[PDB]
């Protein structure tokens, strides 16, 4: 799981 997929690195988080 990537729970910090987007809560770091929001650049590459569109699909959150």
Same mark, same amino acid.
């Given at each position: 799981?990537? @729970? %910090?997929? $987007? @809560? $770091?690195?929001?650049?590459f %988080?569109k %699909? %959150?």
């Open positions: 799981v990537a @729970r %910090g997929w $987007k @809560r $770091k690195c929001p650049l %988080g %699909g %959150g």
